[PDB]
Symmetry: D2
Subunit: 115 residues, 4 copies
């Protein structure tokens, strides 16, 4: 489990549940190729996206479908989605958590990268 | 104006207007003595809290009355207020902007300090 | 375990380890009485602060000693500490996670309150 | 100026100066067409990206080159950039401020939208 995505809701003070998340890897021609996807659980987490074998060094994009999340709650949002773009580097044994904290007109995102 | 407070609303995507702000300074006796107060304007900014003369070295607390803000809009938020505590002017006079970005169950705060 | 505190480091992209955390409850005379304290673990979490029996309705303050954290890393910080002040309400079965994401001149804090 | 970009540095407590910003607009063919670009000033602000005439309805992407910013300061950050994607001017012209608060492993972004 080298990659996990976590989403929190700053309006309700809760995990953001059933948020669609799409992960892409940058291809040689510079296009974004689908890599993994899922929906956050009751805990706002998405586990099992990839394996150590498949998660090679490269540039990844995590798209979080914030607009549909807010719409499902009957709340008017600003962004189309939240996008997190980063390079995975084999600087020893590392697990990546990409987290996002959501408001209708704002989001924060951080990386928690641990052994 | 050596001290300015700026407040934004992350739900509406707007300045946070009419937010009450109370500033305290730690006294010789180690208690929080009233220093200044005001409310944010239409721009979400609060200017004119103090002067270069009065804003001496000290430990300051800026209390931003976020609960009263959300309640005046008919919303029940999590926090009582947002308190920003910092040492000021310990290396001579600086200009401090204390900024806060508000959601019902979350806030962010930053400082912009200039010479 | 009705209360947990989590602290993350936005500079290193890691849990904030060995951060001192002090929790207070507001007393009848309006003073802050010590309630619980600890240091965050390797995961940046502080568990075991209180019990269901002791965590009655009231106003609580969570003080996170951010200044000492940054100093121990050799980094110059802005704030004395981060303070989170909130009312605990028995609106059915609820667990409170108070989380903070730290930078030298900024922090964010959110509440995750779940059944 | 209907579109402004503001960037702050959460490590230094300062405007983020000389940050490159590229704006794209989704074309009829569903690709990201170059729209405007510039760099933040000493105030951390980027004005004059566009005009009321040219800033028509559309889906816009504001790419803030955070990696280049941190690298120019001799720091190795997590993200490649911060991308802010939103529909603009769908209910007539508005003024948009897209703001970002940067740390090496984290960023926050908000919008301030006025009529
Ligand atoms: O706990 C988190 O995963 C978390 C994530 C973000 I992004 C911001 C805050 I405050 C948090 O507490
Ligand atoms: O524009 C601001 O003042 C601003 C203030 C905070 I606190 C966080 C973000 I993102 C901002 O953009």
């Amino acid at each position: 489990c080298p990659l996990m995505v976590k989403v929190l809701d700053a309006v309700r003070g809760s995990p953001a549940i059933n948020v669609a998340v799409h992960v892409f890897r940058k291809a040689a021609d510079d296009t974004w190729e689908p890599f993994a996807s899922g929906k956050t659980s009751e805990s706002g987490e998405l586990h099992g996206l990839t394996t150590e074998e498949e998660f090679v060094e490269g540039i990844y994009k995590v798209e979080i479908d914030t607009k549909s999340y807010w719409k499902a709650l009957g709340i008017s949002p600003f962004h189309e989605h939240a996008e997190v773009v980063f390079t995975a580097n084999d600087s020893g044994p590392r697990r990546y958590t990409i987290a996002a904290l959501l408001s209708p007109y704002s989001y924060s995102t951080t990386a928690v990268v641990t052994n």
